[PDB]
Amino acid sequence: MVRIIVKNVSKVFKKGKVVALDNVNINIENGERFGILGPSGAGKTTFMRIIAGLDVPSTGELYFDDRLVASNGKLIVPPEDRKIGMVFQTWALYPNLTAFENIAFPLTNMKMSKEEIRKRVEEVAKILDIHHVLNHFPRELSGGQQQRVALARALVKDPSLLLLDEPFSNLDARMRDSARALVKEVQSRLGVTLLVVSHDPADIFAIADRVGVLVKGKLVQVGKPEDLYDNPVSIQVASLIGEINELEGKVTNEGVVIGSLRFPVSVSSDRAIIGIRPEDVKLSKDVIKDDSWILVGKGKVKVIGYQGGLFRITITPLDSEEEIFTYSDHPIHSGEEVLVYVRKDKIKVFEK
């Protein structure tokens, strides 16, 4: 319901010495679910605070539709005038207000009578299915209920933009899937534009349709999650979006050579980085007659681990110390030589 134009946005701290965000350009479309993925300190919360209007770009401009909301150190349109709903790191509910009072809070100075407030709150509470615990204080609410109350509070003024800052923390864990589904259900019901920032790729895969990856304040890649996953711009982005094996080798004619292993790819460099995800490696004692799998050579199991009912097998190429791990329900033991197969079109290669 709102289009966000982020234009040449930068943010500095410490008198210009620290650049938290560097020349960020993004156009987020109306109703798009957009995610930002990056490691702690990449500048995620800074970006979010700027979209929220809690801070401003040091240089550059920010537009909501055609409205200039912030510009070069100046807050033009404040948070309360931006039609935003916010769910941050916690459900930051007021501990001493009932769920009803929490949801009613943002309507305090909206020129609404008591009955008008009551009706809006109950209506939103019913849609989020917490109408029945409106008299509970937050502490008496389950995790699922708290989420719903915090969302209700964020949606009580009918925003066109929902902002989520690491809403599924390292808390939850067995409840994260439910919370993700709720967010998505809410977004599709309302058509709101949505921005979620997180360091966890799982949040992004579950919610975002397009994702930007932030590294040290710079947006290094933007695309669909599947696109970052299969076609990462660098090994750092490759590993941020999911598990991957990183190997160093020599660019020798017929591919990249790493000990007894040869990868049918190349780069205009002397040495190269090979990225190959665990699901794209298969170990075998005999030939694989499959045009999907490609033989890259022989290897030897270095060590084996086990978890989630699955074996984690680590091999190295002959005469090499570089390791490749992969998962299987079939264990192969230390010292055993094997054939290493990979999905041809799944090999990633970068200049060293």
Swiss-Prot record:
Changing G144A: Loss of ATPase activity. Cannot form dimers. Forms an active heterodimer. It is a peripheral membrane protein. Coiled coil: none annotated. The keyword Metal-binding does not apply. Optimum pH is 6.5 for ATPase activity. Gene3D superfamilies: 2.40.50.100, Nucleic acid-binding proteins, P-loop containing nucleotide triphosphate hydrolases. Residues 4-241 form the ABC transporter domain. It catalyses: D-glucose(out) + ATP + H2O = D-glucose(in) + ADP + phosphate + H(+). InterPro entries: AAA+_ATPase, ABC-Glucose_import_ATPase, ABC_transporter-like_ATP-bd, ABC_transporter-like_CS, ABC_transpr_FbpC, ABC_transpr_MalK/UgpC-like, GlcV_C, Mo/tungstate-bd_C_term_dom. GO terms for molecular function: ABC-type ferric iron transporter activity; ATP binding; ATP hydrolysis activity. Keywords: ATP-binding, Cell membrane, Membrane, Nucleotide-binding, Sugar transport, Translocase, Transport. It is found in: Cell membrane. Its EC number is 7.5.2.-. ATP binds at S40, G41, A42, G43, K44, T45, T46, Q89, E166. GO terms for cellular component: ATP-binding cassette (ABC) transporter complex, substrate-binding subunit-containing. Part of the ABC transporter complex GlcSTUV involved in glucose uptake. Responsible for energy coupling to the transport system. In vitro, as a free subunit, exhibits a constitutive ATPase activity. The complex is composed of two ATP-binding proteins (GlcV), two transmembrane proteins (GlcT and GlcU) and a solute-binding protein (GlcS). Forms transient head-to-tail homodimers in the presence of ATP-Mg(2+). Belongs to the ABC transporter superfamily. Consists of a typical ABC-ATPase domain, comprising two subdomains, connected by a linker region to a C-terminal domain of unknown function. This is Glucose import ATP-binding protein GlcV. The lineage of its organism: Archaea, Thermoproteota, Thermoprotei, Sulfolobales, Sulfolobaceae.
